[PDB]
Amino acid sequence: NGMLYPQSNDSRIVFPLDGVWDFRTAGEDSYPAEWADAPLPEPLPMAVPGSYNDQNDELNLRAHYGWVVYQRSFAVPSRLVAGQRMILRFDAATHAADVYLNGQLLGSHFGGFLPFEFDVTSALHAGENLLTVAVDNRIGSSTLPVGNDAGTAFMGSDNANVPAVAEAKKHARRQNLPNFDFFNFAGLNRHVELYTTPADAYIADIAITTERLDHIAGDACTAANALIAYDVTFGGDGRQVRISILDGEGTVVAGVTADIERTAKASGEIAIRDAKLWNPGAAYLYTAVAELLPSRIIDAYRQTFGIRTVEVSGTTFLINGKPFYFKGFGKHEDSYFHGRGTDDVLNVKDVSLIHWLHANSFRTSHYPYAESMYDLCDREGIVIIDEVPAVGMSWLQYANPLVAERHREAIRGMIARDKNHPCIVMWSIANEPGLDGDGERPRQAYDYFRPLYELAHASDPQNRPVTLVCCQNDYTTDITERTMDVVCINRYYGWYNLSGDLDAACHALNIELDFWENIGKPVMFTEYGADTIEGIHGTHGEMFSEEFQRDYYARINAEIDKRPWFIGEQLWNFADFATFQGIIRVEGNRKGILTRDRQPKMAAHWLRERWAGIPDYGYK
Template identity: 45%
Template sequence: IKWLYGVTAYQMSYQYHFHLWWPFGMNSSVGYLYKLQVKITNDVYRQPFGIRTIRVTDDQFLINEKPFYCLGVAKHEDSDLRGKGLDYTLITKDFNMLRWLGVNCIRTSHYPYAEEIMEFTDRQGIAVIDESPGVGITKANNFGNVSLQHHLEVMSEMIRRDKNKPSVIMWSIANEPATDLDVSVSYFKTVLQFTRDLDPAHRPTTFVCSQIFESDKVVPYVDVICINRYYAWYHDAGHLEVIQLQLQREFAGFRNLYKRPIIVTEYGADTVPGLHRDPSSMFTEEFQVEFLQEYHKEFDRARQQFLVGEMVWNFADFMTIQGTTRVVGNKKGLLTRQRQPKTSAFVIRERYNNIASGKNTTCDNSRVAKYTSNPHTYH
């Protein structure tokens, strides 16, 4: 489309048979982009954009009217060489590894990512849950008017920047806030409605919930229920046998209250690369594999009904502040901080590719054994 302003006549062309923008794995036309060109005298502005639709039902997330299942990871802007600094080579490496894993969706946990990364998601067909830096909202005094006005300002900045990104499929206004507090209800209802009103495309809007269904007070107002759960890690540490039971209870609790689709936006276990033990125990590569597979059993049951996504925490190990609870950072990554795969990465790769192609999702551990330095534990 070309528009020449400043003369009495202008020319504009229209194309009616559009190529749709699709996420990776849903169509052969992945990440198809058009370019809007605006020319005013000697100034030219070019804006890439994609065409796609989003619609949420009681139990489905539809992109271009086809069911979308989020095969995802959460990320961080972090590496051992640049820290949180921008690095084009690292971005390219990360997106190559996302494709290798079979990932079709990421969450910008817990802040808007660099615009260069968002341009990659558009071109590569990686859907994005775009999250604001609303993290750490855990005390009653965090819900005052000053905080609210700042939160609205941040949402406005994020939407103004990313509103034309076809890869952005949902807004997340906060991560793990204290939505069990009465004061949180009016606060988040305001932010949710403000976000919906500001986005001309009316994308679904959510927050990431860490509260159990009995205590949460804000989930009734979101379009998609997003939950972080760490059964057998932060709760009942090491007890893999509780995962399916607790997930079943949590899913049933939310679904009985609210007929909305659910995404598990975080689940994961810290894993020291190269640490092995038979039988498995926490922090070993074997435990991480078994931990993920227990979640997958319940995911496979629920995704036939209302589950529309699963997102591992985390794509790669990342640095945290020093303290007694972390040994040189958070090690829940499928990859090391240097982007080398742990055994779990091969499990996720097989699962995601099988789901995308409609195959049996049961992981063949004999194949996984080829990629570990302690293969006898998988026989």
């Protein structure tokens, strides 16, 4: 269950397999398996970590449907692998992968945004090893994220009543028809690495939780006492593990030796006096060092963590007992050449931009992000809402067992991967699923999503709040959204409806706000905004002008400022990003307050000014 990021120390080594690989496109629903037995014939180069779609302009890989095959060779010293447990880890293969080492099928995986790994101890041999990875990009009614089995993509245009169109449609080249509004970037989007652990016994998982805070200071910089819990899982086979708590300076401030009881596991509590707390805008990180004892040390892992509590109370969102207000946006892992490929230069820059904007939070729309981004936000005091790739769901999916299991897999996998991050304060179990309507549809939606709500609570040892990001819908027939711990709504009053009319937009918004006021839950925006082409200007800003985006946020935010129970503003989007092509997508989605090259539109400056005057704690 545990998926700790590979670590190098005295008992463990990591050997990265990133770089320029060999690559071939394959079939719509098959690939030659014998490609795993020998070097790929006439291979293309493909850098990895990264989407393959924008890495070859001779081909149109954005149009590709089905399989591609990655391959590379590697060799490591035999003396290093000797006596060790050898693990091959893929941080992300989008969406599904078959993995071969030296002609042996290691196995397969479907989750496109969460890591998976194989024990290759027996599959490895000395000298060059041949690693072949088939990657499947196909989406459909049974995938998460959801694809359409026929018809059009989102916000796709059609003239279905024209006989010639209907006929041509049946012979059209097969394409992925996304059930979501971002491009279906595929491939080895994140790192690949071989790593080592001891074979006989090893640390397999670590969970650190903040259990209680005693006498929190007025500024929440400290608590007189913090009670934290540890849970270390072991693999392999009166054994003991030593746990040391290291502060920001490397000083051991607490330590305990715990017994390993048998799934071998050691668990307990540690009291830390005058603990320095993790807050938005003021991060502080400890390290929990776990050492498996035989004075010598058998295995070790260093787990970063932060000491803080999260509690929804009435209409407030309390971090360390302080009423927090979200300032931020939905993001995407999206950039010009990498596509969905992870880029830590871009992560560092983006985090700096979040600081520049005086934002304090974002959501991982619409899939778990690269792990490094969470580490970065841990050390930079930026709060995260962590979201699974459950986007594009409707009633067709709720009756599908394979979908349900993949959804459960995504939730359990995300939380297993990300549980230790202090920056994460809430889980999102879906984005914009069908929840409303008449007949039994709302009840079917509820019956589908509640056990997933409960699962997220059961899987998270910190028991953070759980939400579901709700599309603009009939809130009166939706019976699911109101039952989340925090109500997270996507609303586009004045854009997709009442278009360009901000007075009417604010009126409508206020009507729905009056509804939510009676619901009595804490409520936040997780999306709202307007497509905006930088350089389009007007003295009276119309849709697509910079002025209109600015005016839009000014009016809307002026309205939500009147509601004490409205605890956050996350807009759409942080930055322009790539989508499936269509008549409403001007070189992708342009609701970014920044361009795709991270340059500030007028709205970004305005929002920066507003957010500079809004405190993380006590705004409402």
